[PDB]
Amino acid sequence: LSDNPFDAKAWRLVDGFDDLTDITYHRHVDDATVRVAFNRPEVRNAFRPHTVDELYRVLDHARMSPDVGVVLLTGNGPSPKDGGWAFCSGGDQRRLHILEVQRLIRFMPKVVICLVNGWAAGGGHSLHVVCDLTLASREYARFKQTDADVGSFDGGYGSAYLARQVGQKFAREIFFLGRTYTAEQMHQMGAVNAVAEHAELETVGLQWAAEINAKSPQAQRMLKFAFNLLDDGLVGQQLFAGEATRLAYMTDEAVEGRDAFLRPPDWSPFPRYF
Amino acid sequence: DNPFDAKAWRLVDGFDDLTDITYHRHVDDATVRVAFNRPEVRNAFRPHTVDELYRVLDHARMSPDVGVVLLTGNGPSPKDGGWAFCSGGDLHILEVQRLIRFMPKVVICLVNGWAAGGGHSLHVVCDLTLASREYARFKQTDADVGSFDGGYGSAYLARQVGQKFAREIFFLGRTYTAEQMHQMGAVNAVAEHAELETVGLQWAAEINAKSPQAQRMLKFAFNLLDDGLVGQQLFAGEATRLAYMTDEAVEG
Amino acid sequence: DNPFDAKAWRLVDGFDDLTDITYHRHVDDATVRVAFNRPEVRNAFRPHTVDELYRVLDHARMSPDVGVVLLTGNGPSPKDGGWAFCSGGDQRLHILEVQRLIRFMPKVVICLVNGWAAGGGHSLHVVCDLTLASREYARFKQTDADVGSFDGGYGSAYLARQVGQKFAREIFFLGRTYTAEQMHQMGAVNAVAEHAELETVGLQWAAEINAKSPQAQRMLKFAFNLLDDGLVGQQLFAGEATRLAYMTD
Amino acid sequence: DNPFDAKAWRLVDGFDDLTDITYHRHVDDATVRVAFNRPEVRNAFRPHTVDELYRVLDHARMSPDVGVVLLTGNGPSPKDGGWAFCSGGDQRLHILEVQRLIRFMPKVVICLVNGWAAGGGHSLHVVCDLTLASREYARFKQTDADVGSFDGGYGSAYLARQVGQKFAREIFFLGRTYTAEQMHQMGAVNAVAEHAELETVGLQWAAEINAKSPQAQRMLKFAFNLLDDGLVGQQLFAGEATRLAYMTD
Amino acid sequence: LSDNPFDAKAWRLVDGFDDLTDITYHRHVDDATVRVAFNRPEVRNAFRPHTVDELYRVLDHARMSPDVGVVLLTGNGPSPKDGGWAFCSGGDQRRLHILEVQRLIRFMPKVVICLVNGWAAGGGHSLHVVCDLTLASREYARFKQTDADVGSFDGGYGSAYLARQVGQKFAREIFFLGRTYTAEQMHQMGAVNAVAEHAELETVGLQWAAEINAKSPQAQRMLKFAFNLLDDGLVGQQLFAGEATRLAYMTDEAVEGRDAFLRPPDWSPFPRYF
Amino acid sequence: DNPFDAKAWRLVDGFDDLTDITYHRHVDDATVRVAFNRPEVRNAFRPHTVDELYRVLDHARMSPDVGVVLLTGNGPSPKDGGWAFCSGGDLHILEVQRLIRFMPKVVICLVNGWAAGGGHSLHVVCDLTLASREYARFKQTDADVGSFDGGYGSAYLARQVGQKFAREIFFLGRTYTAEQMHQMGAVNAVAEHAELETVGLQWAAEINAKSPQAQRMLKFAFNLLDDGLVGQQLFAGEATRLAYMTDEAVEG
């Protein structure tokens, strides 16, 4: 009868983050996976500026954790007030640093999976879009782009990048009409990877995370940056080439280069591959 | 039977002369109806048609009390009772595409029948497409007659259905239904024929109920993805507007 | 049970020495069939396979009377009767040159996935213009990251221009096995066909393509390419426009 | 002293009512001259000026016997004898539509900067295909940020495709005044000419352009555009390729 | 006879940065301008990892300083050891977080002017490339892309972005041959905005900073992001659109939007501009 | 007088049959010399020339002991004593452009004379260009004869000299000297005629003295700016290579 996606036995707190008020941060007991969650279900997990600061902190920390390979981004719930479920309802209307959180997710050399456990609206919908993968609660996920309703707009990863997932016609519809969609509808459109039973949402996220983590970390990083490079232009190039430079630094040819400086370099042993 | 509800529309003053195109303003809504008016010839456009279409769309672009354009074809044919949105060629249609592309408002294509050749490319370039379950027919006959739309007609179609489906549509030039195109991603929704314009109006109303400013920015944001420097010009152009509305811009 | 109609195909002259690949021309149609001929190792390719694939494809590209290439895999495996289009590089970078060959040739290339399409064989399918797949036996699986390798070009990024960024990332990040119907619903497979009729449907598709203005078909292909291939795409497309401007004056 | 040779130009029929702009056709050449006619306010444009500029340019675009537009400013100022091509918007967004008109028309547009080119007038010069400038009197100055405005499109970003990112950023971020020779050395001005011969040189350039295959010239312009104009650039270029494919079969 | 570009009277330290060892950080006594400088002239101002951390900190701080409009990035000198001058000689060979410093400079909504007071080599040359503007010492600036000499490479803002300044032929030459160029040569090629007398390098930087700071801050920010968008693809779009969203939030039309939410919105008063 | 120093070069084994092209390996350096060999006709290429040029460049691409390609024209003409790099058209040259573009080594064009039409476009697509102060002549005659290179010949030229200069070069088709092209940004350096190949060799040696791996990555990094998804394929392709050389790639 318990419906909560959260398995209390599978997560441990992360040292140094006891002061978090708007966000919860866990590490899996076994897996190289973390759980990052909005913690204001009482207001449909809207973020206020302090929420965004905490979210940046946490994701930055996870990015820099060598033993963490996958990030699960979700929202806690339900609301104690009305039992309503929310991933994130966007900006607390009662902010623009959220764009920095977008780039943090876009640029981190690890797969970020959004788990949409309820309402994903406005800024909250856009966070889901920018994530690498999305899994959504069959019963409770609700996607609604309310930006134009309130005279706001996400003209970047929220809208344009949505079009690289569902195509130009559907992305336009989602934003121009701001209708409410289910998990299954978004899956059919191409913005949701798979639909899961509410109670199994995080269980499935964990299975996906494990299938990801079982692969070459190196290849996974190159892959993400390769997907990014399609659309991220010169920044995408910087990141992908950045990873390629890291690879180069490991070859004997690069060791000879640095040895010489510390002669003349000898490139004789190294072929002109083609 | 007919999608067109004559009670809902009023002719636009100043266009009593149109022969290939009809032009209506909704009686209550900030919505216009622009329609091919040569059902007798499958709503194929001749040069005069294009002039009129440009003229009317341009007029609608410049009407500050009009948020949405429904673009469709009148019917049925008096000759054979068939349905056609637009069957293609009988100033240039390329200029009509850009006008639709660049205008700071949502253009919804209502495919009420055959949409072939240039008529199909018109549907592709519109922001949204709604299609008749019974009578919408999507057919790219370009390669069949040794012609091609190498711009919004084809490449932009790939930004809606993906590279595999878009190549199929053009290379084979098969005919597709509303529901097939909906599944592939070129059609937003399928509607019963008689309700096609009723649904269009409902979509237009939901669009018109939003901040017009955010809607304009969003459109150009979607265009900017693919329109390169032109897209930048249009989006930045709006941003400059927002700027002039600022106390900082005033002091300068 | 087998997709290949032996009566329908004739060997191409000048290719009697092929060992890893088969190359047929249709008895009536302007269509050729190029296939991996190593069912024994699930049609995995070795350097010699690539060499042959490239020769064959190049020859097909230059043949003025051929309009469509059908790219597939022979089978079943004599060892276990298992079907495979191509399982990628032999675990026992010329392939990238074959991708470009397929990408750049002024002719439609249709991949017929008759079985396992894994790793580089999956990437081969992605780069093709159209894909038709066997309902019963086509299995799509991107195993790159499993072996610590990756295709950072047409294998991955271009797939995203077919199924979208969410699905493309899933296909690679998880490396799961998908059927013909799943891929068809995602946008990377044009149509699912019954195993036995896969090449038959392939020929019907080739015939509809071959029936249209061939000049139009070339311009359209490069127009679709131009969207993603930047300056190289511009070169190929302008190139054909130049060809058009050499018939008048 | 004045760049305009009155003997060389004839008024265009249907434009007797022009007040902010002058529109001439060359007596012999397939070249027209379009000019700001408000030397009194340093050729600053008001909404009515834009309307006229667009009409004139549109008419020129549609004229089958005109191959080159020369865009310039009349002068000197009757008030102080100061020269100005165009000083931008009248401090006392149709202009963006004029940019696109210049950008998209299948004809070469040459800007002749005979004096001050500031703000939007500077941006007009940037968007033109070629620029020739007066050694003595051309002054290039991007004043946008001074007045809290900006051109975020062809005025700024496109300038970077002429002078590079460092120089383009400098021109806008500092808003300094540059001469013809400086701009020529930076890459935004094609050639510097003596004030008096500016239009003469303009006509010589137009004549060399007008002398080549006009179909080639159109394809080349859109090819250059295609580099930066994305899908819109693809449309225009493909469009002309389509035109080429309508002369054979 | 004193040749040092540094005017000791014109700069004040920045509170909270007394612990800096590898980097110096000053605020101008009058102007909304800061001075950020490499402080290891003894090793030609090569950065080690701790150097990059400090540089990120400082630039991040300057980005977030509302009263600071322009950043002057340079190197201190001369070397006490041999009197040699250096802006920055790149990676301390005796790191890859420098890519994050690149993005910080690329993305900050303020003009960063590099003042090349000596050697700019490897990673140090690339930092200069990514800056919005470059001013260079006539006597002492030396530009040398040594990356390929040591088997390394900057495949992003260091190389490709250089091509958007000097063109494809010159950028290729600079990297493939790794020759040494003067201020004047780089100016002619298009990567240096102006050449200044060594002693007047920072004086000129200050004049440029003042001409920049006298303009609309708003327009300057939009302009930078507009220049970026040419090449930065979707990330560039995110940033430019991000600034446009900030503008929108200021209009009456956006106030009505948020007012409503806090039902129906009324858009009657707001025109459909075109 | 002549740029060519016969003492410095040895014919390449296997190409004793070439008639339109000469092909040399330097006697010490990892550098080859590829040259048009029809000075009698201004080094214009006919179809057979293109086949040979492709063949030789392809061979050089595949030679792991060759770092740099010097591409030039032999002369002077025996008929009139003039100089020509390549004057354009007399498998396809477009395929030669891509081979030059995609090969994982630096191709330096030595313009020793007239470089016109397709010959000019060849110089544009090479990584670096050195030109004879006295005799290099750059002329885009494309529009003059109703032809155009709408790819690397023109668009890519704009990524070297900027949009204004590139448009001038093509629209007017004027003739430029080495020094003019150097100032505009299409020519890396100008050399005295007799020293042209000597300087080429010095540039090649400086290139060859660097990590071949970093050089390949850098080239594709420069290409990736403009070559879109093709550029991505080539750059990623190299990165995959670096990957396979890894202990992680081995364990997999």
Side-chain angles (χ1 to χ4, degrees), chain B residues 5 9 12 33-34 55 84 87 92 111 134 146 172 181 194 205 237:
Chain B
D5 175 5
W9 300 98
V12 181
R33 180 186 189 277
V34 179
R55 208 185 315 166
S87 61
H92 213 313
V111 184
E134 289 85 6
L172 280 76
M181 279 300 167

Side-chain angles (χ1 to χ4, degrees), chain F residues 31 37-38 46 69 74 121 151 157 161 191 205 222 233 245:
Chain F
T31 304
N37 203 39
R38 313 179 70 207
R46 60 182 178 183
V69 176
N74 287 332
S121 286
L157 172 57
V161 298
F222 286 116
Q233 194 221 33
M245 293 173 62

Side-chain angles (χ1 to χ4, degrees), chain B residues 64 209-213 221 232 248, chain E residues 216-218 226 237 251 253 267:
Chain B
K210 298 192 200 312
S211 162
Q213 165 179 268
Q232 177 160 347
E248 188 167 334
Chain E
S216 170
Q218 193 169 71
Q237 174 162 353
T251 69
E253 192 171 328
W267 311 119

Side-chain angles (χ1 to χ4, degrees), chain F residues 20-21 34-39 41-45 49 53 70-76 82-88 93 96 100 107-126 128-132 135-138 193 196:
Chain F
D20 291 18
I21 298 302
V34 179
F36 291 97
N37 203 39
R38 313 179 70 207
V41 273
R42 288 279 168 204
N43 283 326
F45 52 77
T49 316
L53 183 56
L70 307 181
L71 173 65
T72 199
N74 287 332
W83 294 97
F85 162 59
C86 178
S87 61
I93 201 75
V96 169
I100 291 175
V107 185
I108 309 183
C109 189
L110 304 187
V111 184
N112 57 305
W114 281 96
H120 185 268
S121 286
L122 277 178
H123 124 75
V124 171
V125 77
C126 286
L128 306 170
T129 299
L130 301 168
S132 159
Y135 300 118
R137 297 292 183 258
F138 297 82
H193 193 67
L196 176 65

